């Protein structure tokens, strides 16, 4: 397993994220 952390906005905000494939 792998999993990435990432950020992304959404509605005007930043979030703090992962995607784990």
Sequence with gaps: ???VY???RVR???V???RCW
């Design 6 to 8: 990432a950020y992304r």
């Design 16 to 18: 703090r994220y992962r």
């Design 1 to 3: 397993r792998w999993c």
């Design 12 to 14: 005007g905000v930043l």
